[PDB]
Every structure is written in structure tokens, then in C-alpha cells.
């Protein structure tokens, strides 16, 4: 079910995964047309929609430095750690929201980015270079 933009904010993470393109398509293009030339009021909203694309490109750089690159669902090779949210499957995807999920991960979220940027492409690329000659 669609339910439009952010419709599954309180639904399960599994049901919320069914609407990734919906949340993705409405964040980048909130296009205001600034054809009228008004002096001091344009710089504020221009800075706003420029910092918007700066944050978007920061997220895209983070999603490119990883083995994942497709702006979609993707799998990695970094194992999940039992210290992070000691929960089984179906307990997460059927009785939890992405908000509470990021809240519980926020304690251990900072090292996961490092494990994804270094334990992967800093070694996966090097293995790709030393295993593509044969």
C-alpha cells in the first residue's frame, strides 16, 4: 500500500521498505521557481536549497564509498554484531519502526559507518585488483 509520502512512518520496517521510492522522490525536487529577481530574500532560500543538495551529495558520497552504490535496497558483506540490538529476525521487521530502530542503533551507529567504509572497500577493492588478473 502506498499511503503517499511518509505514509509508513509508524508501520513496520518491512511494510515501510515497500515505499522507498516514495520517500526518495519527494526529497530532492521541491523545486521553487525563482524567476522574479528580488534582492535580499533570494539568498536565504537559495542557501537553503543549496545546503539541501550539499547534504544530499554527502549522503550520496557515503552511499558510494560503500560496496553498495545502487540507490535501492542493497546487501553488504559486513556481519551484523550481536551487541547491536540483541534481537532475532521477524522481531525487528514486524514489531518496530525505523524511528525506534535508529534510536536503538544511535548508541552503536557511529562505528557501523566505519565498518562499512573501511572493512569493505579498503579491502574489497584491493582484493578485486589482485583477483582480476587471472
Amino acid at each position: 500500500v502506498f499511503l503517499g509520502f511518509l505514509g509508513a512512518a509508524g508501520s513496520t520496517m518491512g511494510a515501510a521498505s515497500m515505499t522507498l521510492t516514495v520517500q526518495a522522490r519527494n526529497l530532492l525536487s521541491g523545486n521553487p521557481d525563482w524567476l522574479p529577481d528580488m534582492t535580499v530574500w533570494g539568498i536565504k532560500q537559495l542557501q537553503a536549497r543549496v545546503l539541501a543538495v550539499e547534504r544530499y551529495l554527502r549522503d550520496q558520497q557515503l552511499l558510494g564509498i560503500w560496496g553498495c552504490s545502487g540507490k535501492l535496497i542493497c546487501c553488504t558483506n559486513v556481519p551484523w554484531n550481536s551487541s547491536w540490538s540483541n534481537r532475532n529476525l521477524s522481531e525487528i521487521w514486524d514489531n518496530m519502526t525505523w524511528l525506534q530502530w535508529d534510536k536503538e542503533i544511535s548508541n552503536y551507529t557511529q562505528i557501523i559507518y566505519g565498518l562499512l567504509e573501511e572493512s569493505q572497500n579498503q579491502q574489497e577493492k584491493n582484493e578485486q585488483d589482485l583477483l582480476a588478473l587471472d
Binding site: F5, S11, T39, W41, D59
Partner: protein
């Protein structure tokens, strides 16, 4: 058994504050008033407001720590400043004016205060100078000591005339959310203002808000839902204001009856000053009528909502203002171009029993008129309101109130709610209480069973 996996486009938002947009309402091209409030820059409205209710979503709102109100305040201030920048300056008007009372002080028990001033102003050329007249109105000095006079506006800041081509009619301006961000709108009828909204929707563009500068009384505001709302950042603290939102609008009809005229006297090579001409016909003070039955019902409905906070079967009172600034002690607003300062001393004389209170078809309120305003927080500029040629009559819906409680050890006794105001932001919290700005963070992680290569 299970590995980390990323998901892009997840419904995750975090509360933040960023620059917003503004709407052109789409009727801006057909107004053709050259420049209204925000007709300058805002973009036309989308054909369909994307209002999407988010089921199972409860979001904690806090209207008193909101940043949209600060954005709208700074935007209104810059609007005033950029609207008055290219208009006619009137710095040579700060001269000596030999004035005289009006020729009709009939029955001096009633008041009549318009000064037939005349003064030597600069003309088209710089060599010669010409004597003109007719500045009028109450705001002036008492002179240092036909009686001499001068402008206290000159005693404070510089003066500039408002452009006669622009208008002050509030166009419906609703803020919009940029790319990457969204606006959560609460939907339940009764809202505490601070707390968890159980019925939340999301939008980009808000609902139409009319920028109205008003004190003591909120005009052309958004009606409440089924119940009168009594909002406050801290109800125990006396210093914090008390905002009141009405269920039913209170009809008000304000009138400047002086069938007035104007005079365009040329000053400088390009400028031209609009002076208040002679009053053709009879004269009487401007006023505002409110139907007494509707006001009685509104007060009797608000007192029961106040008793929920300050006790059942108790008495509350409210007299007129305490004292201080003219803009704080008087219901000040604009209409047609003329700035009305009315005294609400005739509406707040009430004590309330547990069931009743302690004909008259309508209640009238006297109102003085002011053309030079120092309401700008920049005390380096003031605006001269151009005179309006003709009679003025403007109707409006009263929708809100701003009250202050008398402090002290008044527990065993009764409580008093005198009118007040001052801060412009309180005028905006009656419209942005249901709105919160959030930023989208669509990068999530979760464990599932899968393997690469």
C-alpha cells in the same frame, strides 16, 4: 546468519530548523496592486495541496520553541524595510509648525483634537520655499516654552512616506517546505499546544495565513475546532502571555467616518508629499462596533475554559489595560491604509459568578488615528501613512485574545486577565501552533539474510 543491509528512502525524520518558502496564492496577477505584502517574490500555489495523513504516527509538538515563528517575524520585518526603502523620504518635513485647534470644538466636554498646522516647506526648486498647511491629528509635541508645534517622530528617528501605490491588504501567504524537508500538521480538534499530536498529517505548503499586525485582538485569524483554546508556555508564570483562540468569530465593524481628501504638494525634483486635506462635511471620531450579544456569549464561553485551569465555581475578573506604550495599551491595527488605535476600556468590565455575570444592541469603542508609526524595531526609521481619500469602513472577524494575569498572592481571591501584547511573535503562534518543520534522513540499516558475490 544475518548481515547488515542499507535502505534508502525510509520514513525517518528529525526535527530541525531551516529556511522556508512562501506562496503567491495564484491570485497575485489579477490583483495588480504593483506590490502587496509578499506579492513581490513568492511563487504561485500548487494546484492540489498534498495533505497526507500519517496513520499510527504520534508526534511531539511544541509551539513555544518553534522556529517558524522567528522566520515569519524576520520575514515581516524585512518586508517592511524593503517596502519602505525606495519610497519618498520626508526628512525636510521636520520643521516648526504654527498650528491651531480645529474650528469645531462644539461642546468642549467632548474631545476634538486635529491641529490646522501651517509651515514653510521646501518646494520643487531649492531657491524658493513655499508655505503649506494641513498636517492635522493628535500626534505632536506641546512645543518648547496659533501655537508652535513640531513632530516627536523627529524627536526620535528619521521619517519616510509609505508609497501610495502599494497596499496593506493582507494577501493569504502560506509558507512552503523546500526539498528534503516536510511540515507536520496536527489534526485533532483539541490541542494542548505542547505535547504529542495523535493525528498527524504532512505537507509541503501550509494553509493560507493572512499577515495581520494587531494587538489585544486577533483579526482575520484561523478559527479553533469546536472548543475555545487557552494556550500558554507556562500557565503558572504570570509574566508569560495567555493566548486565546475562539470557536465562533466575533463580528467587528470599524469606521473612519471623515469623508477625507488629499493634497499632492511637490517637494524636491521627483518626490511628492501627500498631505491630509481639509475635512469636507461634519467631523466625528473613528470608532468600532461589536455586537453585545456575540461578545457576551464569547466571554461566557471563554470563562468556562478558564475555570478548567483556575478552579471550578470560582470568580474571575478583567479590567482594562494597566499602562505603558500606546501600541500595548490599545487595540492597534490597520485598515484601508489608516492605522486605528482603539481603546478596549469599554469591553473589559466584568465579574463572573458560577452561572451568570454582574439590552444595548451594540457596544461602540472610540478609536484615535495615527499616521506616523515607530513600530519598527529599528528605531532609526519611521513610516508616514498616506491619507485615504474618502470614508473608511472595514469589517473583520475577531478570533483571538492576548491576556496577562495579575501576579501576587491572589489564590484565595480572584484572578484578573488584563489585555496586553507587544511581541509580534504572539500574533503568529495562533497560526503556526499546528506546524512543525522536519528534515528527512532516508538512510537506514537493518539485518537480513543475504550474501554478495
Amino acid at each position: 546468519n544475518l548481515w547488515v543491509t542499507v535502505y534508502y528512502g525510509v520514513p525517518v525524520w528529525k526535527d530541525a530548523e531551516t529556511t522556508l518558502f512562501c506562496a503567491s496564492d495564484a491570485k497575485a496577477y489579477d490583483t495588480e496592486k504593483h506590490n502587496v505584502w509578499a506579492t513581490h517574490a513568492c511563487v504561485p500555489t500548487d494546484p492540489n495541496p498534498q495533505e497526507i495523513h500519517l496513520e499510527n504516527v504520534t508526534e511531539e509538538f511544541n509551539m513555544w520553541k518553534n522556529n517558524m515563528v522567528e522566520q515569519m517575524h524576520t520575514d515581516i520585518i524585512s518586508l517592511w524595510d524593503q517596502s519602505l526603502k525606495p519610497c519618498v523620504k520626508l526628512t525636510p518635513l521636520c520643521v516648526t509648525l504654527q498650528c491651531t485647534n480645529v474650528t469645531n470644538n462644539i461642546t468642549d466636554d467632548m474631545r476634538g483634537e486635529l491641529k490646522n498646522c501651517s509651515f514653510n516647506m521646501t518646494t520643487e526648486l531649492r531657491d524658493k520655499k513655499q508655505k503649506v498647511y494641513s498636517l492635522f491629528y493628535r500626534l505632536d509635541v506641546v512645543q518648547i516654552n496659533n501655537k508652535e508645534y513640531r513632530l516627536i517622530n523627529c524627536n526620535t528617528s528619521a521619517i519616510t512616506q509609505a508609497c501610495p501605490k502599494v497596499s496593506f491588504e493582507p494577501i493569504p501567504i502560506h509558507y512552503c517546505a523546500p526539498a528534503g524537508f516536510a511540515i507536520l500538521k496536527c489534526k485533532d480538534k483539541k490541542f494542548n499546544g505542547t505535547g504529542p499530536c495523535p493525528s498527524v498529517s504532512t505537507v509541503q505548503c501550509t494553509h493560507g495565513i493572512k499577515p495581520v499586525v494587531s494587538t489585544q485582538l486577533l483579526l482575520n485569524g484561523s478559527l479553533a475546532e469546536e472548543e475555545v483554546m487557552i494556550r500558554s508556555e507556562n500557565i503558572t508564570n504570570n509574566a508569560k502571555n495567555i493566548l486565546v483562540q475562539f470557536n465562533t468569530p466575533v463580528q467587528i465593524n470599524c469606521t473612519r467616518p471623515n469623508n477625507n481628501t488629499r493634497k499632492s504638494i511637490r517637494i524636491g525634483p521627483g518626490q511628492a508629499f501627500y498631505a491630509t486635506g481639509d475635512i469636507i462635511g461634519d467631523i466625528r471620531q473613528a470608532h468600532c462596533n461589536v455586537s453585545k450579544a456575540t461578545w457576551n456569549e464569547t466571554l461566557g464561553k471563554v470563562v468556562k475554559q478558564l475555570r478548567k485551569h483556575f478552579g471550578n465555581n470560582t470568580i474571575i475578573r478583567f479590567a482594562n489595560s494597566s499602562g505603558g506604550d500606546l501600541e500595548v495599551t490599545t487595540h492597534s491595527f490597520n485598515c484601508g491604509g489608516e492605522f486605528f488605535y482603539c481603546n478596549t476600556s469599554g469591553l473589559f468590565n466584568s465579574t463572573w459568578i458560577s452561572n451568570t455575570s454582574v439590552s444595548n444592541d451594540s457596544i461602540t469603542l472610540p478609536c484615535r488615528i495615527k499616521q506616523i508609526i515607530n513600530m519598527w524595531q529599528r528605531i532609526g526609521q519611521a513610516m508616514y501613512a498616506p491619507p485615504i481619500q474618502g470614508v473608511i469602513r472595514c469589517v473583520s472577524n475577531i478570533t483571538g485574545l492576548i491576556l496577562t494575569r495579575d501576579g501576587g498572592s491572589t489564590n484565595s481571591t480572584t484572578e484578573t486577565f488584563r489585555p496586553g501584547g507587544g511581541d509580534m511573535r504572539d500574533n503568529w503562534r495562533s497560526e503556526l501552533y499546528k506546524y512543525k518543520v522536519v528534515k528527512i534522513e532516508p538512510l537506514g540499516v537493518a539485518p537480513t539474510r543475504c550474501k554478495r558475490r
